[PDB]
Design a protein around this ligand. Structure first.
Ligand SMILES: *CC(=O)N1C[C@@H](C(N)=O)Oc2ccccc21
Length: 377
């Protein structure tokens, strides 16, 4: 690329971004020396360090909520600029060292229990993840031709799914106002990105070309094509049979991967980073296994955050599916993504939810939970 060479004509410090008041991990890792060493490297697709750190430069963040500050344009991005990604991965994934190994377990039989979470508290159970198809650039860097290719192969694979997974595909471009309305009412629809995060990163290029929503006829399995990763996979079920949701998650992923392999394509995966995705923060399992749960008394407790932290879980939001119950209903999911297998995260969620329910009941009786406080897991 001639532009990166023209940049190289400038002193490195003269091209170094001003990350003074930034609070992302990239700003915490990017020394002026690292920029000098890597500001010349590039990936086969043409992804540069500036293309990796632009979002972090434009989007400072909050000290409380530390964003990663960088994205990947392709698989090779994680190795070409590993001298930058690895420290941020260590900092954002609990000290995951460069030599650590990620184990991926997708055998639902290895999860203990989780079939009967108290239906009077757990309203919904959902497991979400992402996948990148090897050989294509990621959404921040992919091309119209690429994107259209991935959409074609993904739609073929989904159209091959049958049974409880048999479903339909809606292309965002061809959607009628009626179909769009139905999807919005279903909470299945993703709209055109508007955040200064995504728009600056180029994740919204050529919208809505090659972007789609596939869902099974039972509204329990949903796939998003070319939105924020090549595929975004969600398995959801009203209630608390987390085992069923995770089993659907696993089997659907396995069938999709089998179809892709039959067509000589595969997911981006390695034994150190797990599955490869645009954002470093979703590496390894990209798994967000959560529950919408009625924990009104516990939510107003001054230890709720500490209990969630010790259980290795996070409160990703409040309100539940239909907003409404903000303060009473909470969306609680696994906090870790890399360094733990999928089964381990789902386990952690089930186990923590049981104790949360017990705490909520005890607080209901007017008693104290100081005896039920867990130890850091
Ligand atoms: C990790 C992630 O999803 N990010 C990080 C974010 C930031 N500014 O730190 O920027 C973007 C932009 C586009 C896609 C993903 C991310």
């Amino acid at each position: 690329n001639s532009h990166n060479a023209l940049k190289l004509r400038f002193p490195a410090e003269d091209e170094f971004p001003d990350l003074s008041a930034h609070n992302n991990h990239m700003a915490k890792v990017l020394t002026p020396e690292l920029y000098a060493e890597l500001r010349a490297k590039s990936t086969p697709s043409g992804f540069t360090l500036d293309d990796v750190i632009q979002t972090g430069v434009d989007n400072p963040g909050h000290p409380y909520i530390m964003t990663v500050g960088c994205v990947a344009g392709d698989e090779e991005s994680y190795e070409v600029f590993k001298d930058l990604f690895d420290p941020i991965i260590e900092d954002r994934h609990g000290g995951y060292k460069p030599s650590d190994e990620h184990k991926t377990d997708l055998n639902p039989d290895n999860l203990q229990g989780g079939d009967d979470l108290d239906p009077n508290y757990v309203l919904s159970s959902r497991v979400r993840t992402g996948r990148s198809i090897r050989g294509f650039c990621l959404p921040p860097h992919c091309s119209r031709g690429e994107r259209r290719a991935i959409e074609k192969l993904a739609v073929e694979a989904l159209s091959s799914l049958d049974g409880d997974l048999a479903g339909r595909y809606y292309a965002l471009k061809s959607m009628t106002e009626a179909e769009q309305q139905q999807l919005i009412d279903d909470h299945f629809l993703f709209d055109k990105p508007v955040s200064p995060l995504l728009l600056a990163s180029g994740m919204a290029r050529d919208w809505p070309d090659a972007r789609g929503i596939w869902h099974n006829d039972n509204k329990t399995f949903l796939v998003w094509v070319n939105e924020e990763d090549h595929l975004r996979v969600i398995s959801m079920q009203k209630g608390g049979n987390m085992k069923e949701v995770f089993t659907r998650f696993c089997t659907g992923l396995t069938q999709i991967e089998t179809l892709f392999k039959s067509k000589d394509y595969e997911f981006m995966w390695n034994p150190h980073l797990g599955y490869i995705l645009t954002c470093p923060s979703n590496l390894g399992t990209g798994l967000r296994a959560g529950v919408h749960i009625k924990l009104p008394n516990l939510g107003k407790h001054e230890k709720f955050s500490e209990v969630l932290k010790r259980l290795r879980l996070q409160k990703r939001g409040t309100g539940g599916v239909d907003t409404a119950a903000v303060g009473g209903v909470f969306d609680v999911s696994n906090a870790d993504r890399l360094g733990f297998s999928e089964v381990e995260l789902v386990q952690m969620v089930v186990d923590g939810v049981k104790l949360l329910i017990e705490m909520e009941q005890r607080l209901e009786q007017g008693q104290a939970i100081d005896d039920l406080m867990p130890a850091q897991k």
